[PDB]
RNA sequence: AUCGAGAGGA
């Protein structure tokens, strides 16, 4: 009698039904736009709705900075799919291959750092920080290190064989400032990028052959990630990543542009979304036309579902 | 329906303690997103999905 | 002219503040917490460099050569060790947004020479 | 034009670029880079217009004034042109990089958003992203100015 | 041993097909709700 | 959902060629070879067959409401 | 029918 399931059931139902994310009494204080009715006009509309993002900046805001397509949105957010009206530049759609981290516990990473030459902040001499490197795990400074290069190599090696460090874990080394950042929390956007050797792709004909018969030897994308040829790179890790657009950019040329590539894109077309991949030859169109089609495909009429009867 | 195990121990005086574990106490019904690991459509083949009048191509997530 | 750094007390490990004994007029640095005091030698209390005429080589660190992002060249050899490879970039800092002068860092390990043509 | 821009970049890196009066060195550097690129775009558009024949429907609808323009013909045939955000080139969204596919401190036309190809040829993916930025800026201006104009 | 340019156009799309056959398209929502209903509720209760 | 009876542009019958087209496809024929075999000379009818998806088969998986 | 919210079109 003391307990009441009514609060839990009714509150969850009310939030999911109205969209006001908060208490029922604070209806005006609650934020709207969450829990919208699923668009079932067409399958593309349904998928785009299921892969939709938004930013709580507000439609009344006249500042153009939040709505501007940032350079950072590459491979994470479709550069064409956005509402034409007031929500332009605020409501966004996920890129096709974009995956966002579900979160993990950084305890194994902290234990491994303790096992390594990482020195605890309470034990370090105060004068050992100027020339050493600082290590941050999930935002909290946990210690200093004296071989950041070797530590980063070892951490990447662990991440590439499904060891204590999982694939989704971010690992950014900024060099100008000696900080080393390791991220594990949820909400981090990332995409799979092919790892590149000295100058060569790590993916090989053996991997492609085993993927060809994907229905026989159960060699799947999980095995691809485990073998260490594809890595999930988040946004902050992309700053230190040198990306080859295609393997054609690794071939030696008469003039050397980069010659130190560390990653390669699987395919450039993955930057598009769901309603933008329907466009044939989008590189021969003007961008507002691509955006108009991305908005207009959700209005296209077809078989929205097989069990419409 | 979500059930929670509750352990109530009465402490009054003179080491008069006794723990009564109210196993599987109902706390509320949590809405389940379709195609999740706790939906009845998880892992079901397309034939079974069609048997239950559900579209195999339906992605869920709602 | 040069710059002036702060001084610490040998008793409480607090900063020494400028002070002066009128009897001898000798630049003293007296800690204002305790009675400890010291005799200065720089004879300078405060400088304010507006032209910020400082060398960016001091701020440049030698561990940046291990960045797989910055460009590399073989046409500017290191003067200290003769190594052909070098990594170059701009000042990329405030009060140095202009002056696109290239700052070169030797790639070879244990040298880390930073210079500018 | 690419060779000329490389020459400006080398001159800037060798401290051989004396700033024009009333402008900063990066200001002078950019202004002349954009001048070179704009001259190249105008010249290639003029070449496309000359190449156009009397039976061309683009030219027909342009000379009639019904639709299109010289800039539309030029972007369709010769060169789309420089993509500009807030009146300047594509900003360094990353750490001194417009996209992670370039090197740090690269003020070349391709890095800063000079779409080298035409619409008929098709844009490379970096150019596609930069053109998407430009179109987004146009949409932002269109969707923002209306309330102030109505007031 | 190495992917030749005339085979890369097929190899890359085989890789992408493997990705979309394993992961899906609603994987972010599926995994987020699984995370919630698996550890987040227990974390709250404890 | 189902194969249209006629080509939209010219009105030639294409509703009796879907099963034969599928049989030719299973008989290792190229799509264009099958279209030529079925006498689809015009590219309108070639489109009408080549771009057709057959959702009636998927709809037939669900059980009928009335037995 | 009222309020509020969301999605949209020009
Ligand atoms: Zn003192
Ligand atoms: Zn050297
Ligand atoms: Zn026909």
Automatic annotation (TrEMBL), chain A:
Q: Where is each RNA polymerase Rpb2 domain found?
A: 36-100, 135-197, 221-268
Q: Where is the signal peptide?
A: none
Location of this chain's protein in the cell: Nucleus
Q: What's its job?
A: RNA-dependent RNA polymerase that catalyzes the extension of a non-coding RNA (ncRNA) at the 3'-end using the four ribonucleoside triphosphates as substrates. An internal ncRNA sequence near the 3'-end serves as a template in a single-round Pol II-mediated RNA polymerization reaction. May decrease the stability of ncRNAs that repress Pol II-mediated gene transcription.
Task: Spell out the family assignment given in the record's similarity comment.
Answer: Belongs to the RNA polymerase beta chain family.
Q: What is this protein called?
A: DNA-directed RNA polymerase subunit beta
Q: Which organism is it from?
A: Sus scrofa (Pig)
TrEMBL record, chain D:
Domain of life from the UniProt record: Eukaryota
**What is the role of the protein in this entry?**
DNA-dependent RNA polymerase catalyzes the transcription of DNA into RNA using the four ribonucleoside triphosphates as substrates.
The record's family statement is: Belongs to the RNA polymerase beta' chain family.
Protein name (record) = DNA-directed RNA polymerase subunit
Where is the protein situated, by its record's location annotation? Chromosome; Cytoplasm; Nucleus
Automatic annotation (TrEMBL), chain F:
Swiss-Prot/TrEMBL GO biological process terms: DNA-templated transcription
Q: What is its main location?
A: nucleus
InterPro entries with a match to the protein in the record: RNA_pol_su_RPB10, RNA_pol_suN_Zn-BS, RPABC5/Rpb10
Q: Which cell locations does it reside in?
A: Nucleus
* Gene3D superfamilies given in the database record: Homeodomain-like
Mind listing the UniProt keywords for this protein, alphabetically?
DNA-directed RNA polymerase, Metal-binding, Transcription, Zinc
GO CC annotations on file: RNA polymerase II, core complex
Q: Which domain of life is it from?
A: Eukaryota
State where Zn(2+) binds. 7, 10, 44-45
Q: Which GO terms describe its molecular function?
A: DNA binding; DNA-directed RNA polymerase activity; zinc ion binding
Stored NCBIfam families = PRK04016.1
Task of the protein: DNA-dependent RNA polymerase catalyzes the transcription of DNA into RNA using the four ribonucleoside triphosphates as substrates. Common component of RNA polymerases I, II and III which synthesize ribosomal RNA precursors, mRNA precursors and many functional non-coding RNAs, and a small RNAs, such as 5S rRNA and tRNAs, respectively.
So what family is this one in? Belongs to the archaeal Rpo10/eukaryotic RPB10 RNA polymerase subunit family.
Can you say what this protein is called?
Answer: DNA-directed RNA polymerases I, II, and III subunit RPABC5
List the source organism.
Sus scrofa (Pig)
What gene is it encoded by? POLR2L
């Amino acid at each position: 009698l003391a307990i009441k399931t009514r609060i839990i059931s009714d509150g969850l139902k009310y939030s999911l039904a109205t969209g006001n994310w908060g208490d029922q009494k604070k209806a005006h204080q609650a934020r709207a736009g969450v829990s919208q009715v699923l668009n079932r006009l067409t399958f593309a509309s349904t998928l785009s709705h299921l892969r939709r993002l938004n930013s709580p900046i507000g439609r009344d805001g006249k500042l153009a900075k939040p709505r501007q397509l940032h350079n950072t949105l590459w491979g994470m957010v479709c550069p064409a799919e956005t509402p034409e009206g007031h929500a332009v530049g605020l409501v966004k759609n996920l890129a096709l291959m974009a995956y966002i981290s579900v979160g993990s516990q950084p305890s194994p990473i902290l234990e491994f750092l303790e096992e390594w030459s990482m020195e605890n902040l309470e034990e370090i001499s105060p004068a050992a920080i100027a020339d050493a490197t600082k290590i941050f795990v999930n935002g909290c400074w946990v210690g200093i290190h004296k071989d950041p290069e070797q530590l980063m190599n070892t951490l990447r090696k662990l991440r590439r064989q499904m060891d204590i460090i999982v694939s989704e874990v971010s690992m950014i080394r900024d060099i100008r400032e000696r900080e080393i950042r390791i991220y594990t929390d949820a909400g981090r956007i990332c995409r799979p990028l092919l790892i590149v050797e000295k100058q060569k792709l790590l993916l090989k004909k053996r991997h492609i052959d085993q993927l060809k018969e994907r229905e026989y030897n159960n060699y799947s994308w999980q095995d691809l990630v485990a073998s260490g040829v594809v890595e999930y790179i988040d946004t902050l890790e992309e700053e230190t990543v040198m990306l080859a657009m295609t393997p054609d950019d690794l071939q030696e040329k008469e003039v050397a542009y980069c010659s130190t590539y560390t990653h390669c894109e699987i395919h450039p077309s993955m930057i598009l979304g769901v309603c933008a991949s329907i466009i044939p030859f989008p590189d021969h169109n003007q961008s507002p036309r691509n955006t108009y089609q991305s908005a207009m495909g959700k209005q296209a009429m077809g078989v929205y579902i097989t069990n419409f009867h | 329906p979500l059930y929670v195990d509750i352990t109530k121990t009465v402490i009054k005086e003179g080491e008069e303690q006794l723990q009564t574990q109210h196993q599987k106490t109902f706390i509320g019904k949590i809405p389940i997103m379709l195609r999740s690991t706790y939906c009845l459509l998880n892992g079901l083949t397309d034939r079974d999905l069609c048997e239950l009048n559900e579209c195999p191509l339906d992605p869920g997530g709602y | 002219p040069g710059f002036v750094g702060i001084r610490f007390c040998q008793e409480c490990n607090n900063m020494l503040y400028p002070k002066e004994d009128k009897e001898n007029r000798i630049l003293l640095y007296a800690c204002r917490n305790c009675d400890y005091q010291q005799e200065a030698d720089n004879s300078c209390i405060y400088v304010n460099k507006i032209t910020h005429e400082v060398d960016e080589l001091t701020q440049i660190i030698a561990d940046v050569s291990q960045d797989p992002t910055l460009p590399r060249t073989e046409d500017h050899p290191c003067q200290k060790c003769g190594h052909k490879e070098a990594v170059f970039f701009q000042s990329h800092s405030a009060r140095a947004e202009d002056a696109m002068r290239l700052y070169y860092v030797c790639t070879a390990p244990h040298c880390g020479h930073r210079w500018t043509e | 034009a690419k060779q000329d821009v490389i020459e400006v970049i080398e001159k800037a890196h060798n401290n051989e670029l004396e700033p024009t009066p009333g402008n900063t060195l990066r200001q002078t550097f950019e202004n002349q880079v954009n001048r070179i690129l704009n001259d190249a775009r105008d010249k290639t558009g003029s070449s496309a217009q000359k190449s156009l024949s009397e039976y061309n429907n683009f030219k027909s609808m342009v000379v009639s004034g019904a639709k299109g323009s010289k800039i539309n013909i030029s972007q369709v045939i010769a060169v789309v042109g420089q993509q500009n955000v807030e009146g300047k080139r594509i900003p360094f969204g990353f750490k001194h990089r417009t996209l992670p596919h370039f090197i740090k401190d690269d003020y070349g036309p391709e890095s800063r958003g000079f779409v080298e190809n035409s619409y008929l040829a098709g844009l490379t993916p970096t150019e596609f992203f930069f053109h998407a930025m430009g179109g987004r800026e146009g949409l932002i201006d269109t969707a923002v100015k209306t309330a102030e104009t109505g007031y | 041993d190495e992917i030749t340019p005339d085979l890369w156009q097929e190899a890359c799309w085989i890789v992408i097909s493997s990705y979309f056959d394993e992961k899906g398209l609603v994987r972010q929502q599926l995994d987020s709700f699984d995370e919630f209903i698996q550890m987040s509720v227990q974390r709250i209760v404890e | 959902m189902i194969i249209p009876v006629r080509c939209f542009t010219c009105g030639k019958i294409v509703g009796n060629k879907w099963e034969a087209y599928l049989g030719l496809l299973q008989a290792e024929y190229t799509e264009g070879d099958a279209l030529d075999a079925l006498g689809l000379k015009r590219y309108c009818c070639r489109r009408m067959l080549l771009a057709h998806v057959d959702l009636i088969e998927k709809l037939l998986n669900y059980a009928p409401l009335e037995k």
